[PDB]
Structures are given as C-alpha cells and as structure tokens.
RNA sequence: CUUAUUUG
C-alpha cells in the first residue's frame, strides 16, 4: 500500500524526540518551536550577534534535522521553524546561540551545506529584532511626535533617535529600541497593518539589514567620535 | 549574498 499517501512516520518521529529530551515543541496556531535546551551548559545568551537564520529550506524537512544541525555548530538557545498553508507550505527558520561566536560558525557552516542537490540553503545573522526601522516619516514633524503617534500600539520603546538616513537621498531613518522582539513586532505589525502615513506624509516599516546597520554606523560613529 | 518572524 502506500507510496500514494502522506507519511505521518516523519511528524511522528520528531514526537518521539522531543519527548525524550523534554523540549515539548510549543504550537503557535500551527507553527512549532524548540526550547528547553539538554543539560551540560548553564547561562543565557548575552548582548551578542548570537542570532541566525536559515531560508530556501525545502518544504518537507522537519526540525528533527535543522535543529541537530544547529546543535553541533554550537550551543543552541531556542530555535523556531515556521510554515504557511496560503497554497503550499514555506521552508524558513532561525535560531539563538548561546554566543556570537555558535552563530558565526553556523552561518560559515550550513551556508556552505547542500542539504540537497537542489537546495543551497541560505543562511544570515543580524536580524536581532531587537530594533525597528523607519523611512519616508513625516515632512517636518518632530521626533518627539513620531514616537508619540506609535507609542500606545508599541509602549515597548525604550529610546528612539531619527538622523542617519540610508541615503543618498535625505529624509532620515527612525531607529527604535524595543523592550523585546514581539515587541518591536507589536508596533511594527499595526504600521504595515495600516498605523502608516502619519501626519498625512508617508512611511515604509522595514528591519535593521546588515548592509543598512553599516552605513548607519559609519555616519553615527560621525557625531560620537567627540563630545 | 540566492534573506524572516507580526502569520499564514
């Protein structure tokens, strides 16, 4: 029989793991993520580029092979796999390290892994959610109205600072530092879900990019060289 | 780089 039929052996498996290891995958309305690291190391990731992302997964693989794989780069911290049911079910996930240095080997590690003949699967880091972007913003308003005007969907906003803009062209970029990632996630959702156009102007709701946080930090570094 | 969570 079979050979014309769904293998449910494979879901099956990953459940006969987790519960051997007591990690008990939390279900996100049908997404699914790892935690609960095995014993043998105690601590918490520090501030570190600790954060990494793999993507052009295929769309069948389980984390019962991603997740070992990020466990023998380095010491994981939580890992998460998503999927979308739209018309066909997406491949990407990504995972904490215990430290910069789990993540930096990841990436050189499983960027360069061909789990298959047909899949490169591509890796990336920096994306610590941590901190928000913003673009276009308001004509002349002031940066103590723009937090303002997104400070009830995102009372998470630690500090903000508007200057160093993308460029060329001007316009500045509003950086902002959450409490946490859904939190900048809470703020950012309600300006894509439609919070955007503030004081009648434009806005485009965007992440830090590691091509983005370079030229950010290279004319930010301007004004802090000195006091 | 062939780049993602807010969610399907």
Request: charged share 20%.
């Amino acid at each position: 029989g079979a050979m014309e039929r769904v293998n449910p052996e494979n879901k099956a498996a990953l459940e006969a793991w987790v519960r051997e290891t007591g990690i008990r995958l939390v279900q996100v309305n049908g997404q699914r993520k790892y935690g609960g690291p095995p014993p043998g190391w105690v601590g918490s990731p520090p501030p570190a580029g600790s954060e990494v992302f793999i993507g052009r997964l295929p769309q069948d693989v389980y984390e019962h092979q991603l997740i070992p794989l990020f466990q023998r780069v380095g010491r994981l911290y939580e890992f998460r796999l998503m999927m979308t049911f739209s018309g066909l079910n997406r491949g990407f996930a990504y995972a904490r390290y215990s430290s910069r240095r789990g993540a930096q080997a990841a990436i050189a590690t499983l960027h360069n892994h061909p789990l298959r003949p047909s899949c490169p699967l591509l890796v990336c880091r920096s994306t610590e959610k941590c901190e928000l972007s913003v673009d276009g913003l308001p004509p002349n308003l002031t940066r103590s109205a723009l937090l303002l005007a997104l400070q009830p969907l995102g009372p998470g906003l630690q500090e903000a600072r508007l200057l160093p803009s993308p460029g060329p062209a001007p316009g500045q970029i509003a950086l902002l530092k959450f409490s946490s990632h859904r939190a900048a996630a809470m703020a950012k959702k309600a300006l894509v879900e439609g919070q955007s156009h503030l004081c009648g102007e434009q806005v485009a709701v965007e992440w830090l990019k590691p091509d983005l946080k370079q030229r950010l930090r290279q004319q930010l570094v301007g004004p802090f060289l000195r006091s």
